Amino acid sequence: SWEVGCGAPVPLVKCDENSPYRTITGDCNNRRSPALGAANRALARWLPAEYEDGLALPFGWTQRKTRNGFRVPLAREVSNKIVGYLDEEGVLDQNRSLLFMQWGQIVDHDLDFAPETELGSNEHSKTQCEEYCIQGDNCFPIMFPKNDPKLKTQGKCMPFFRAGFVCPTPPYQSLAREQINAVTSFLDASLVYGSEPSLASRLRNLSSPLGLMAVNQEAWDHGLAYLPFNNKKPSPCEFINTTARVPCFLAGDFRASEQILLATAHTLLLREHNRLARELKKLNPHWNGEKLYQEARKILGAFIQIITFRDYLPIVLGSEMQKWIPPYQGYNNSVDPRISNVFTFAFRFGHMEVPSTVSRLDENYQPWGPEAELPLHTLFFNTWRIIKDGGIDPLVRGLLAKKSKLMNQDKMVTSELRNKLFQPTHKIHGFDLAAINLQRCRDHGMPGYNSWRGFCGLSQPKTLKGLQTVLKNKILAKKLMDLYKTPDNIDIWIGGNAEPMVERGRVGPLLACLLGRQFQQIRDGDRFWWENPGVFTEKQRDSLQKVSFSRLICDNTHITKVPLHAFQANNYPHDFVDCSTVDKLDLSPWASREN
Numbered sequence: 001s002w003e004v005g006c007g008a009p010v011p012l013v014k015c016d017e018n019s020p021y022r023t024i025t026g027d028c029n030n031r032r033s034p035a036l037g038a039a040n041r042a043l044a045r046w047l048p049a050e051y052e053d054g055l056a057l058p059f060g061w062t063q064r065k066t067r068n069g070f071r072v073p074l075a076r077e078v079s080n081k082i083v084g085y086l087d088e089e090g091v092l093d094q095n096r097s098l099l100f101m102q103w104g105q106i107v108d109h110d111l112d113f114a115p116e117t118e119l120g121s122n123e124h125s126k127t128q129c130e131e132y133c134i135q136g137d138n139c140f141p142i143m144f145p146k147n148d149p150k151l152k153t154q155g156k157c158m159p160f161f162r163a164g165f166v167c168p169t170p171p172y173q174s175l176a177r178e179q180i181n182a183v184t185s186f187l188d189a190s191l192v193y194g195s196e197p198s199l200a201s202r203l204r205n206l207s208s209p210l211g212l213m214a215v216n217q218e219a220w221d222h223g224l225a226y227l228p229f230n231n232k233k234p235s236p237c238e239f240i241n242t243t244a245r246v247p248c249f250l251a252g253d254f255r256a257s258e259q260i261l262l263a264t265a266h267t268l269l270l271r272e273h274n275r276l277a278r279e280l281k282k283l284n285p286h287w288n289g290e291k292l293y294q295e296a297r298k299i300l301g302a303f304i305q306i307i308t309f310r311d312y313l314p315i316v317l318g319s320e321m322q323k324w325i326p327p328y329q330g331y332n333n334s335v336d337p338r339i340s341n342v343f344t345f346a347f348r349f350g351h352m353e354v355p356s357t358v359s360r361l362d363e364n365y366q367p368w369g370p371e372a373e374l375p376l377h378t379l380f381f382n383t384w385r386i387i388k389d390g391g392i393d394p395l396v397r398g399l400l401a402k403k404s405k406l407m408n409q410d411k412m413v414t415s416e417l418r419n420k421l422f423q424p425t426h427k428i429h430g431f432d433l434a435a436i437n438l439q440r441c442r443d444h445g446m447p448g449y450n451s452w453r454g455f456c457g458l459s460q461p462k463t464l465k466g467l468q469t470v471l472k473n474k475i476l477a478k479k480l481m482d483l484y485k486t487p488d489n490i491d492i493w494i495g496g497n498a499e500p501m502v503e504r505g506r507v508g509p510l511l512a513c514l515l516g517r518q519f520q521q522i523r524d525g526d527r528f529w530w531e532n533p534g535v536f537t538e539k540q541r542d543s544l545q546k547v548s549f550s551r552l553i554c555d556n557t558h559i560t561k562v563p564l565h566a567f568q569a570n571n572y573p574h575d576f577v578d579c580s581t582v583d584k585l586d587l588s589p590w591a592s593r594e595n
């Protein structure tokens with residue numbers, strides 16, 4: 001115990017220390033310990049991993065081996081019995097726009113990514129797993145329980161591959177298994193710019209010396225830009241409609257095209273960067289290209305952090321916000337800014353907020369066309385609807401005018417995700433996000449629910465009666481007990497999300513604690529936190545608290561009526577105001593004079 005050694009995946013760089021800009025890999029943020037918070041390093045472990053063989057074999061891997069005496073139940077069985085429901089009526093969040101959910105997915109994607117293992121392009125293991133479901137090495141399939149309707153239709157399992165791990169990737173040995181975070185821990189807009197110098201460069205337009213991001217050349221959205229198309233074939237975006245042949249978008253983060261709405265938001269940010277850059281060029285004619293890139297980049301980062309901490313978190317945590325995130329006192333170099341392995345599962349509460357359908361609205365916020373409301377599942381890796389069916393304006397209005405889904409103990413995840421999820425790799429619209437989340441909890445060797453309740457100083461129920469009290473639900477507590485036999489065994493993903501919500505928030509006591517700590521840490525340990533004295537100027541900071549997502553919309557679409565508070569539920573037209581009634585980000589404080 002104490003390694004500090006093991007680390008084949010660098011890639012290492014030299015630190016400048018007087019550079020006023022963040023590296024792209026996240027390196028050099030912390031001067032004493034320069035790799036803290038960098039992309040491609042192990043996720044942090046707040047608690048010792050809990051694997052079946054104590055090292056890397058996940059629970060449920062070996063049939064004959066129990067966990068605390070009992071067999072862990074199949075991911076899908078838990079999915080079938082606890083997580084799914086049929087009635088979408090009455091399910092929407094009365095005070096959260098659809099944007100509430102989509103911002104979460106953006107933030108989370110800026111902070112973490114544990115990609116799956118490769119070791120296979122020109123591979124049969126990709127197929128010895130999909131076709132016959134043989135568990136082995138990195139294939140760790142999700143078996144269907146008896147009486148599951150996907151048996152008669154899909155096969156005997158859903159292919160699933162274990163997450164990538166530090167040092168090698170290969171067979172391997174030694175210490176406990178640690179998963180990789182392929183992105184930077186700092187809230188630094190890494191999802192727009194990339195986390196590798198390799199990708200960050202491809203993304204840029206180095207033809208023009210104006211510091212812009214490369215835009216699409218085959219198509220436009222009323223003279224406005226779109227993200228470039230990705231080079232790679234086979235592309236999944238052209239697969240869902242072999243006819244329209246539209247590839248996925250190339251963006252800072254690889255998951256950008258996962259669903260039409262996420263792609264949309266990515267477009268807004270790409271656009272704000274370029275707009276920000278042509279404006280800086282206008283007041284500092286003399287600045288060079290990189291100067292424009294970095295400074296534009298720097299602003300957008302500050303923007304993502306403000307919206308997130310000022311607008312978003314307080315309605316996620318509710319009354320529990322001040323208790324985990326006291327006000328900012330300044331940079332603290334003794335804080336571990338690394339994303340913990342558990343945070344990547346607690347932040348998945350967002351999955352219970354995804355509604356079953358997506359809408360496009362017209363200028364008066366009316367159904368745009370005859371097939372205006374689409375089932376969420378026709379939108380996974382759907383790029384052609386944007387390019388070939390209206391642009392993003394119709395979708396952005398839907399973001400502002402529709403509601404998020406409200407987590408609900410009797411109605412957790414929509415069937416659009418629990419039964420019809422499309423994986424970029426396989427061919428069917430038949431995966432189960434819920435089962436995958438659970439299978440991945442085990443892949444990552446996460447401690448049980450009660451381990452996490454103790455961590456947060458919350459009571460730990462040992463009995464049915466005990467758990468009814470904490471969940472405030474007899475039916476749920478029961479279902480759960482029958483499957484897991486002991487609360488010690490409840491997987492944290494479902495454990496945390498089953499708890500009733502906190503006052504004015506959207507997650508419970510356990511999740512609030514986990515989320516709260518993480519964010520406190522990425523703020524306090526981020527040398528480039530926007531409020532950190534010296535990072536920006538007093539006059540610059542003053543201009544930055546006037547940013548709002550509403551404005552972002554005005555400056556980058558042709559939408560003219562927007563809500564003043566985009567995250568709460570807004571009705572058209574009473575709640576919407578004209579874009580000219582809205583605080584603009586004044587860039588005058590970024591002007592630079594010679595003598």
Ligand code: HEM
Pocket residue numbers: 101102103104105108112113114115258259343344345347348349350351353354380433436437440
């Ligand atoms: C329609 C919207 C969404 C889709 C289709 C979707 C789908 C997925 C899929 C397929 C995974 C990978 C699961 C695995 O292999 O472990 C994933 C991961 C994840 N989702 Fe989403 N998701 C959506 C929305 C959201 C939202 C709103 C949030 C949070 C507010 C969220 C948080 C996460 C997080 C934190 C992960 C783990 C990231 C990592 O690997 O580090 N997701 N999602």
Ligand SMILES: *[C@@H]1O[C@H](CO)[C@@H](O[C@@H]2O[C@H](CO)[C@@H](O[C@H]3O[C@H](CO)[C@@H](O)[C@H](O)[C@@H]3O)[C@H](O)[C@H]2NC(C)=O)[C@H](O)[C@H]1NC(C)=O
Pocket residue numbers: 095315565568569
């Ligand atoms: C729907 O959600 C809204 C936000 O979740 C909620 O209103 C929010 O309540 C907060 C309480 O802190 C208010 O914040 C500001 O309140 C005073 C003025 O009363 C200001 O001087 C302070 O700056 C303080 O930050 C807001 O009025 C509001 N949040 C925002 C900015 O939108 C609604 O009440 C919810 N709807 C219902 C009826 O449940």
Ligand SMILES: *[C@@H]1O[C@H](CO)[C@@H](O[C@@H]2O[C@H](CO)[C@@H](O[C@H]3O[C@H](CO)[C@@H](O)[C@H](O)[C@@H]3O)[C@H](O)[C@H]2NC(C)=O)[C@H](O)[C@H]1NC(C)=O
Pocket residue numbers: 240241243244384388
């Ligand atoms: C695959 O992508 C196709 C488009 O890329 C899509 O079809 C398109 O959408 C409809 C067909 O249902 C047509 O749109 C409208 O065209 C005129 C108005 O401009 C109307 O007269 C038509 O009635 C229709 O409403 C497009 O012409 C059509 N585009 C093409 C080239 O076919 C397919 O539906 C997609 N298929 C799948 C499986 O999603």
Ligand SMILES: *[C@@H]1O[C@H](CO)[C@@H](O[C@@H]2O[C@H](CO)[C@@H](O)[C@H](O)[C@H]2NC(C)=O)[C@H](O)[C@H]1NC(C)=O
Pocket residue numbers: 205207208210212213214215216217
């Ligand atoms: C990189 O930047 C250059 C220069 O701004 C872009 O060239 C412009 O392209 C737009 C859109 O096609 C046209 O209005 C002009 O023909 C060009 N203007 C200038 C200033 O030359 C180029 O399209 C960008 N390339 C990428 C991949 O984004």
Ligand SMILES: *[C@@H]1O[C@H](CO)[C@@H](O[C@@H]2O[C@H](CO)[C@@H](O)[C@H](O)[C@H]2NC(C)=O)[C@H](O)[C@H]1NC(C)=O
Pocket residue numbers: 329332334335
């Ligand atoms: C920076 O963060 C550290 C660690 O998070 C804080 O250190 C605490 O110091 C107190 C003494 O005041 C000790 O009792 C604790 O052991 C430390 N807490 C923890 C959880 O590590 C410290 O509060 C911060 N530094 C400053 C001065 O702001």
Ligand SMILES: N=NC(=O)c1ccncc1
Pocket residue numbers: 254255258422423424
């Ligand atoms: N269907 N898969 C994805 O690529 C993905 C999309 C969003 N978040 C994580 C993974």
Ligand SMILES: [Ca+2]
Pocket residue numbers: 110111183184185186187188189190191
């Ligand atoms: Ca980041």
